[model samples]
Target: MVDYSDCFEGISGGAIFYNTKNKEYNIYNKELIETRRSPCSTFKIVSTLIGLEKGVINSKESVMGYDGTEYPNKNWNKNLSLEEAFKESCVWYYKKLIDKVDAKSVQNILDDLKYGNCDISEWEGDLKNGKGHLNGFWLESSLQISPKEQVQTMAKIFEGDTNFKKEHINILRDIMKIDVNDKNINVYGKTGTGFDEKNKRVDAWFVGMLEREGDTYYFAIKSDDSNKEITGPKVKEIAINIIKKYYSV
Candidate 1:
């Protein structure tokens, strides 16, 4: 195991990287690696798999009609296919998709995948309590997962160790693709961000797998900061830098 604490400067965060080729685990900020927190948009990875497996959305080409609701992100205002929605990290799209899926089925899949806590008790969200209007457990609600578990979950799906269809997984990999601008590395991942209602803390995440040379690396990076500046894209940049530093590429 190697500790890359230097990679997470000026933030309370941790990261875990598992090399499938040598079966080794490298981690930073070991204490926070096992801590569980809301997955936010990162849960879309599983939601996409569920959406595909259950036929909620057939393929990347499947489109969701835009309700014309203006969001802070202009990219989300227009109609989006599954691929485009995933790339934009559009929450409303996934929320609608997951809403089409039965709660019991989602719970069963989470149990099967051994997702962290596997808790969806707050499926309706805290709307009654006035904690924003997002309706789902993954958005700083009941669903939570650790950085270590996030890496493990990536391995499970990518390694074909689960019951999810290979075709769906392939589509997911296609959508999760992250362009690192390097010929030797192919990366696929998701970023999640949420504000804690109880503590007012900001949590951000970047989780996914990277293929370099002949080896496969599954990793997760979680960051917590009191400042609102910490966000999904911010955490993703940190993860990418860590990956580059690790490989010296």
Candidate 2:
């Protein structure tokens, strides 16, 4: 039950850390741990899993051709493989991938995962206005999850509680691999960002697992602020700092 509030600075945030070896849970900002908000790009982890299981993403080498629309991020403008798209958190790639999945199937997967509120009612999104369909649902839209639930969901993934194929989970783990330059540890994670339409605030998330010396640590962090400085990368730094502190690494 350690509190790591100092790591978040002034932004409103919450984090949950689960140490599988000792069955210990460290919670920070307990008040907001259960607050639900749009999962944004973090949902990509689930979507990627779904895509892999559904054969939409047949392999790690599967590439999605770019449509020639110039995006703010240059990394997204070119054709990208599934791994590349996940690493870059390219919105377009995932939107296209999820679009290929049947809406009912996607809902069933969410229901099976017990993800957040499991609300996919706004499936079509702002499609008529060209805002895209899936993003409207995942990106600050109908889908929402709490930081606590995030950690639980992540635990389910890594713990093999779902019916997904082992090969697909391995592919997902490979996609989430992060290089922390530490030989004693292996880190896997995903970052998410979304804007709160009502208050014009920004929400940032970083959720994943760290394996070290035969023990696994699962964590989820969420932070929101009116200042645009709060972003996915920003929260990632915060999460890493806290994780490192636990190991004194």
Candidate 3:
């Protein structure tokens, strides 16, 4: 079992574990009544999947970012599609998709896919509160989750997806996918770094898979550390540590 009691880069309070197999995402598959956290960018997997499934966007091709948000530089939001946006963690472009799609449709699509326990309350607040709940494009909420649930949610994404079976799963297997490669193994996953200065919490996350030929594994982790900074690459570093330790890379 992968554990984080010794990790210094995690938050003070959060539950975490790996889901060995997908058990829910389908309502009839199981009763997921006890909804827990808000599921920050981790939930972006759903958005990305929805865009692909609906043909609203493609994994490739850079699309224009949302005009409603600010950026670190001029022309930064331009030429950003789902693929680059996911890699760079572009808030402006993703937030645009989230805002345009409307949470109900997103929620429905996720529910159909059995990805329950997600709520865009913060997204709603962002529009109502005059854009204070986001940083450029990311949301402004606690957006927390149990690592066990995270793993399960992601595993379901891999099994049900038709648009990108290997490509989507390759994210962790290839992109956010850290650790040593065991040939013929398969990995499908995503990662999230949620920073809320107001909540005074730094949420670090990595969710993905490990597969080689026919062998495959799925996992998710959430690190909440008060002192650690929540920059994208930094959090990815901390997340890699978890992968290495558990996967024995």
Per-residue lDDT over 63-138 for candidate 2, one digit per residue giving the tens place of the 0 to 100 score: 8677889887898889899999999998889888888899899999999999999988876553544565335587
Which 10-residue window in model 2 sums to the lowest lDDT? 125-134
Considering TM-score, which of the candidate structures 1 and 3 is the better prediction for this target?
Answer: 1
Cα misplacement distance, residue 218 of candidate 1 (Å) = 0.4
lDDT of 1 by residue, 184-219 (tens): 899889999888869888879999988887888999
Highest lDDT against the true fold, candidate: 1
The parts of candidate 3 lying over 4 Å away from their true place are: 7-35, 65-70, 73-75, 113-116, 122-138, 142-144, 161-189, 196-199, 212-214, 228-232
For residues 43-79, write the lDDT of model 3, one tens digit per residue.
6666675665555665566475455445554544566
Instruction: Report lDDT (CA) for all predictions.
Output: 0.87, 0.84, 0.51
Cα lDDT over the full model 3:
0.51
Error of 1 at 95 (Å): 0.9
Query: How do all models score by TM-score?
Result: 0.95, 0.93, 0.68
TM-score of 2: 0.93
Ranking by TM-score: 1, 2, 3
Order the candidates by lDDT, highest first: 1, 2, 3
Screening candidate 1 with a backbone cut-off below 3 angstroms (N, C-alpha, C), the clashing residue pairs are none
